[PDB]
Amino acid sequence: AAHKSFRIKQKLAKKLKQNRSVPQWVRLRTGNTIRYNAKRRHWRRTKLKL
Amino acid sequence: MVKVKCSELRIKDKKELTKQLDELKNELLSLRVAKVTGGAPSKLSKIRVVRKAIARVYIVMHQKQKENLRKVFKNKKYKPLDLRKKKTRAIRKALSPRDANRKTLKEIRKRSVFPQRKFAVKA
Amino acid sequence: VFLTHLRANKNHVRAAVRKLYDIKVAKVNVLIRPDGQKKAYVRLARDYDALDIANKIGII
RNA sequence: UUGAUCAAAGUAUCACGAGU
RNA sequence: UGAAAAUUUAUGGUGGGGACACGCAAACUUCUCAACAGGCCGUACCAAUAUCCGCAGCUGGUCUCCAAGGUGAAGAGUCU
RNA sequence: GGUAUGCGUAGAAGUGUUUGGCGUAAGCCUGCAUGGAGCUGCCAUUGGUACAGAUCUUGGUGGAUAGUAGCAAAUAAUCGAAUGAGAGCCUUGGAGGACUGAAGUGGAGAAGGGUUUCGUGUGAACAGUGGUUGAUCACGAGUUAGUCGGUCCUAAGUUCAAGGCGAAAGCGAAAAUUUUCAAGUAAAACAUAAUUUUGAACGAAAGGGAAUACGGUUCCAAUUCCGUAACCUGUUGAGUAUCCGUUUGUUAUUAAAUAUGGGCCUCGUGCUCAUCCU
RNA sequence: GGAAGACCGAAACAGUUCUGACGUGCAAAUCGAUUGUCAGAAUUGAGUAUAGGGGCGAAAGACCAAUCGAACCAUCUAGUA
RNA sequence: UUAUAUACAACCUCAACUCAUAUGGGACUACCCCCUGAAUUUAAGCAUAUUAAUUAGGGGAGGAAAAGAAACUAACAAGGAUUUUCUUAGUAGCGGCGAGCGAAAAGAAAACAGUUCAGCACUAAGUCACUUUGUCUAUAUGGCAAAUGUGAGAUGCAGUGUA
RNA sequence: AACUCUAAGCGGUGGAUCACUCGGCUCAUGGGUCGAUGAAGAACGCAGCAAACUGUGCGUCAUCGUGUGAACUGCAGGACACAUGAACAUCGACAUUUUGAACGCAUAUCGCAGUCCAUGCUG
RNA sequence: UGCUUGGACUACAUAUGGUUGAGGGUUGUA
């Protein structure tokens, strides 16, 4: 940490803003197939590296 | 507040248009306050409609900013790059079709005097 | 405080706030909150009151 | 005999002048 | 036989530019002193017997920084 | 593909079965009970055609045990108060016992982590025991600089202009040969003059290196924020040796004048001599 | 008077004998007793070279990402018996 | 204009340009094109054969690509551009004459389209392209002349003429 | 009654059977469409409550004209600006951040430039 | 003048002109 760079500050928001759960109403679409997420990150059961 | 029909906006002027432009974006930023402060309606949801209303203005502003160019860039060669008929690749840079049918002299004398005659060789 | 687009070169805020509100800047400060947003810091002048600024604008 | 030297002087005839 | 180079001083140097004495001065002046801006991004926390890598909160390998009272050779080892 | 005026929500396929039966046997026919939309018999053809097996592939699930194996290293926890549906803990806060011993289980830095840091709220998996707090979720905030630092310089070395070679890609390469392959330099006609060899660039938050620190401050941030106190770099501006002998001030001695003299001359007024610090 | 690849020793490292402690661990190599150097052939964080029949090796065929008498990953590969 | 003592005009090789004005590396790949060329396998083993003028092979194209108008056939009562299919034929020879390889004109079917270059004699550069200025319009890197404004062009442009 | 043996009922772990399939692969006729005007792939930024897949490019879940002719919808809220078009699809208009074949020198650095006008303050 | 804020620009290989050309290359006029 603490000496990142301006990709790995902007890359790390996208692997941060994707760490919500499901939108908390959108399981009332038509044909709701979304229970909880596929990409769902913890941070010791899942690594980043890309 | 009415939907700005772009058919209506084709009669206006650019000085009125920029006057029409900033009259909406200045009010727009005040609407974003209610998004973050949680304003008085459930939502001041006009920032969908006024957004596309704002985007209706730029293009017709660009249109006469475009349409005035190509009439005064008539009657030249060495044309503007961004105004040069963006069609394809494999027929721009290979031998233009008014210029690739330029038949040769010893091939337009054998197409002069013995022509194709439309008969039916039959008994 | 301000939240801005991602090319705020610290003088565009010095350009814009006096263009939008006639507010003298004092010291324009910038940090990037790592969720992808550039939170801004600007300091008023003495004659401008901060509670008078947003109450003019509408921010409580 | 652990200094040091660049960047024309000299000369010649013309410019042999301009301003005056 | 114990790195390079960015940046830097002073000196040397032929030219050249200052350069009147009844003064008006001037001085990238290496002096005193006043206005004037200085963009870009990185900053929270763990920093390892619970945030690292060890398929895991696993006695395992992890770069250095500060470093006290006593006894005593002492950064020992025992003790607050 | 032909076929049976084929049965089918008035229950069609498989699933069970202590209903009943036919074959030598593989296999059907049949009753009931689920079940909810399609199915079989004769005769022509035919395809990836019937499984106990392959240290067979995949997905449940046993006995041992579904409570045995063992969760034993780092001295060692404890009563009372809370609160809690419920506490050996952790969750606290009250005591007060012992450890870590300053080449710590302590305070902050690197690589790597990437939202863990913080408040607020909590039910279940998560914490190889519990759970009222957690490095889990829910939900909110949170990282401010001219001086800290990347940024410039260059190190071993990437071989990274087209001289070259290779069928092309590209070359486990001190590319030192490549009209001028000069950076140029206030410059002068009449290749501006002797001059410059590799032209380019990356490469160190550990080496080189513009310049600062002090006190307090928040729910978490500080050589950054305010309070106050300096500096650097660049730009601009103002003052800043520098007015003489003499005589304007002043009788002169003196004084603005950084230190005036000189011969001459009627003294010199005239003349001459000149300051790029003492 | 303080020189030497000099000695006994500590964090730095190494890994000897016990063939001791678990050998469905604490672990796809570690813990606990013991032992050696310890001011240089020393110990090491970063940068950079070296390439699959070769790199590198104070030389064991060690080491090259838990693989090393030739890796490691897709194919000609349902390769042959 | 060359004791290496000056100009000017050409020429000739030859530069430099934030000149003008414009063309190209790249993506994909089944098919296609010129390339480089391996191996298990088969021979009961293997070394020439085979896998094969083959998978990476990568440079190139397109709606076609390459070929194509014979320096061919055949040897006959002749035929006649190139490509794909049926057959020639699993026959001719190549073969450790081992395993295994392997065509072909000729016969019939689709479609059919033949011709510019070079070079005598072809006999007033009669050529071509920019430029600018207008004609004419058009999303033309455009049609008509001109100044005959350049330059290209005799080291050869054009017309007619070609196995 | 414990327990163990055995049938069925019944509850329970399980997902096999049969059915159903907004999909797969095969078969064959059609057409020429690949960039220096910025392609192909990525990074991000996206919207009211939004992570994705899909859509886009500061005009950011869509976009001018066009066509057809009233809605998308879990909900709030705007529309009925149908009647001078909802919402679709078509699509010619305009747009096209960021990077490539990097067309500035150049990337483990959003860093270093250089030319010229425009536009603000020095002044 | 310098600051900050916009734009346009500023690859290399390369073809045909354009400009300025360099040459004890080759002559010619002197």
UniProtKB/Swiss-Prot annotation, chain A:
Gene Ontology MF terms in the entry: structural constituent of ribosome
Top-level taxon of the source organism: Eukaryota
Family matches, as InterPro entries: Ribosomal_eL39 (IPR000077), Ribosomal_eL39_CS (IPR020083), Ribosomal_eL39_dom_sf (IPR023626)
Record keyword DNA repair present: no
Coiled coil: none
PROSITE patterns named in the record: RIBOSOMAL_L39E
GO biological process: cytoplasmic translation
GO cellular component: cytosolic large ribosomal subunit
Keywords: Ribonucleoprotein, Ribosomal protein
Gene3D superfamilies named among the record's database cross-references: Ribosomal protein L39e
Family membership: Belongs to the eukaryotic ribosomal protein eL39 family.
Name of the protein described by the UniProt record: Large ribosomal subunit protein eL39
Organism: Drosophila melanogaster (Fruit fly)
Gene coding for it: RpL39
